Symmetry: C5
């Protein structure tokens, strides 16, 4: 796909807006029986015996949407090119709440321990699904069958081996389904993703402060070193993210991970391609 | 709503000054018996049983003022009019030095015979400058929280705007959970955040810091200026000759001897520079 | 006060050097009995009953000096005069290296048989350069605090300036609670902060860090310069040929064996570059 | 070598990609007997009596590869060399560290989640036209490292360390020419050499210090020096080196093992004329 | 001394390389030397006075480098840039020192962490030092032997030495002899030196250090002039305390690392 000139003319620029709700394990608000924990995992707890058999509710997964863009070609073609994005984690202020009814206290008579600890923040803008690389802390982990999360065993069609604690070139997938690819199993593949831009960070520790910023004045430019943004194949724009904001500390000692939604406003332009 | 050229002339630039005192829950210094806790919450505690029924005094809220600006147009019926355009702001959290006090009479000690635990832990800092009220998005930690009813003197929360009880979706982004920041000390911080899908005509800047005893780390200087112009060189345009200024500055917990903890906020000062702009 | 052109000619630039020793509460090294605690407070403790009646030795205060500058105008009744304009400063906290000492005889050991807990915790750092005294705003953690009443002109607190008791509004920003930083070691840091609504003719820069054992993290280099010019390229103009220099540098607690804790301060050095400026 | 002009022409620029798996002590995934701990050390403990006699599985080492480049010269004292000009590099598998439910993970408190991988971090990478020059320096010169096996100061000196090896001993030098063989706690990059390499690193100590890492495919490191010259690949070999210790796995018993992650590289190179 | 033009010529630039080993208290590896690059155990006594031993007083490292001789108007070497690096940073991943205090039962050793102090200086003459101490009642060993404030004053310290006493001044002219806890760079002098430093206090505060051979520090002042080497001597000074070694008993010792320098100098015309 050879990249030609930017299309000149009236309706050459467009804007795409959307938000993605977090897929922490309880992924739907519409199941009365368990939806009270929507945007959280269940309780995360080392079993103390082998092997680990994590349940789907304890496996935060990436959020993804494919956005359909205005059709460009009737019959060398025009493609939408993503050039910038404004993105924001929404609901940050909710985390000042230190009086959840079942919050573990910092000490006797004190306030709740605020949401804190492990953070994981990433977003990606691309013209096709984000490429994923599989790597796990423990290859002996027995993830649930797709029946359900997509894990390394799913893509290999056989059990993990010790090499899956490192980089196994065969352990690859595409982020093509919302709330189905666990964060603990899949990371962005730096060996591919030529047609995506991704940005991420992690923070470990149990009670490490959650420190986050928000402003409507911040823009990320999506152009590469040659001045070309992601090109949207088949008029589809892929947007991916994850925003783990820390643990909810419960009175019993039990802890669950929590996530927040993310907002996007992407600017695109028409580009001639060969 | 076409933006035209900047107005040229002698009195084309004006400077507006204000301060906003914090609205942490005890929101008035003038109450008969309870005002000693002005700029603080009451004691924040998990109930231990469901549901949470938090009191007003435990719900820090946004500060907001509308500033009336000099009237610009002798004829309001014209297509082309002059509007005040906010171009920069100098803003400072006031009273930062007060937080070196480690000898509050009822302060929990760091250890036996030691000084008090200094104000520390949860921080939340934000300010916004707009030509109209700041747009808010509702999202809460726990949808089952029973906030005091607005009709009973309570704050404005999600149930208020929906006309019905929250559902689990309000733990995520619900597009119906929206409001405008149009009342000082009535929109709880733990319920409302700036709405990034709107606010075309505002600029906002904010941060959070969680943890229980996390150091409060703040700077102050009269040399720092925030430029309010967007990518096109246009600042917020003041509709009806009104400038909207919003903020929140939670600076941490006061740790009391018994173990009880209350949040504390500080005031914020603003000096906004505005210029006259022709608009169609 | 119309600012004209920078003066041209041979000796149009001058340099002013000084240092300011900290005023932590024990403010003199020349007292027979108590001067061992020079650069420290006494022991800081919550009283445990109301009200707090803090002693002067527990109230770190701002340092300040007024430097007399060379006289410039033979005839002071002329409309157009030369004034010294402060354009840049090199400033440094002195004695930072002294804080590696973890073997002070009465230092609390971190754990059994260990090294002393080093000077750490609450930090407060600020400096200002101005052509007049720094403008101060009063705000306190607790309005019920009973600060010392003296006959010797210090410490000056909100009650001192108001001529009446504080009220709850003094936990926020009370526009009547204002003062000028015109006396060395007399204005308590926990009561007074720089007033961002004034200070047009000064530049100030500060920060706080709370927490009990938070690392003290400081830099020093003789290569760092602060430019004092505002947006128009004008520095503070020295009224009456006087340069005002103010600062505070609390660097943390000395943790004593008994559990007691005292705040500690370090001195600050300044080298200010000034130029002659025509003003009308 | 005197550096002449950048070669002009159609195929004067090439790209090289590769990944390096971590060599934390259990260095192979292909030994059914012990490979379950691949990318970790064994349990790290003070012996409690002198001397320390660490096992190889407790000595994280540098990763290294020599990448063979296309042959440039059919020959003359004037020739072409590959010049590395930029690199995109990324630590892979960062997301794996959100796992706080490893079956034998020490809990933060009763009934809580596992203590996340945290504590000691050491991160470095190097790109060079020859092996990275190493300087030896150890915490304790009386440490008895396993005989070569890992290469340590005793190996290169052909005699026992002395106290001077707790500081900089100019005799304690090596070249990073073998994957997984040079212990990190013994060897660091030698700033007195490495004219033909570029290296970047950091350390973080503490026991439970947050592991804080970033990843983006938009970040490029420029490898040109102050004269606009990148590393020049002697004998058409490109040397890539790294280490990425990401913290401790805290086990239920109290035991602790260090953990590492792999690193990816995409290096851009151009043809450069050189003399001698 | 009037600074004239930069000398233009074939051999007008030179590079000076050196390293300085740390002087933490046990300052020689050629003796007790098992503790080279460390202090002895640092421990508040609990009773007065404090009479610290010389092995518990980390001191600045310094070298005078003799430069190639060049000569009212003469040439001087002018230091224009430096690449400097703390050596041996990787050694600090060792959490299995045989006598290391454990983080908890069955755990690894507490890594080297806590108090850090990092500084370097490049000058055309000795670094100017200012004396200031935590406690004027500290009784430092007599010079026979570190140089301290009592050494320079010729009389005991008074309370004023907890602040800035303009009489408490010295020149950093001897390696391993000027205690870090007594002396700091004098910002009121040092016109012909450039210095850079930081401190981090705390007991177990993470040691966070960087290393790269791509980082350069420009030594030129605001007028484009670097330090000028009087009598053809370049002064290089540093200190790099990297934290505590935590021992099983509870005792703690400070530890330092060496520092490497590569200084670029050029010839400069000057007038005396
Ligand atoms: C928001 C507020 O005023 N909080 C008080 C708190 C309340 O008065 C509460 O309703 C009563 O506990 O009381 C605090 O002080 C306590 C005393 O009132 C009580 O008699 O004895 C307690 C210790 O045994 C304690 O001193 C509290 O609970 O900490 C103070 C707090 O500001
Ligand atoms: Cl993160
Ligand atoms: Cl914050
Ligand atoms: Cl500070
Ligand atoms: Cl690191
Ligand atoms: Cl430091």
């Amino acid at each position: 796909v050879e990249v030609l000139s930017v299309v000149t003319g009236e309706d050459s620029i467009t804007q795409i807006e959307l938000y993605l709700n977090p897929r922490m394990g309880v992924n739907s608000p519409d199941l009365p029986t368990t939806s009270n924990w929507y945007t959280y995992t269940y309780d995360l707890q080392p079993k103390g015996s082998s092997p680990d058999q994590p349940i789907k509710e304890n496996l935060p997964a990436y959020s993804v949407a494919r956005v359909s863009l205005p059709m460009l070609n009737e019959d060398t073609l025009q493609m939408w090119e993503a050039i910038s994005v404004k993105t924001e984690v929404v609901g940050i202020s909710s985390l000042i709440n230190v009086h959840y009814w079942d919050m573990k206290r910092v000490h006797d008579y004190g306030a709740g321990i605020p949401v804190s600890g492990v953070n994981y923040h990433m977003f990606a803008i691309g013209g096709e699904p984000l490429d994923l690389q599989g790597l796990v802390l423990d290859y002996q982990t027995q993830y649930p069958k797709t029946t359900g999360p997509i894990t390394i065993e799913t893509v290999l069609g056989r059990k993990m081996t010790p090499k899956n604690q490192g980089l196994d070139p065969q352990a690859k997938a595409k982020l093509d389904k919302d709330g189905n690819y666990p964060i603990e199993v899949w990371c962005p593949d730096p060996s591919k993703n030529e047609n995506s831009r991704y940005y991420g960070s992690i923070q470990t520790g149990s009670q490490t402060p959650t420190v986050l910023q928000f402003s409507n004045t911040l823009t990320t430019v999506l152009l590469d070193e040659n001045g070309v943004g992601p090109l949207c194949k088949g008029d589809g724009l892929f947007i991916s993210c994850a925003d783990i904001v820390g643990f909810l500390f419960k009175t019993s000692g039990k802890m669950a991970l929590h996530g927040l939604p993310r907002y996007f406003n992407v600017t695109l332009r028409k580009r001639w391609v060969k």
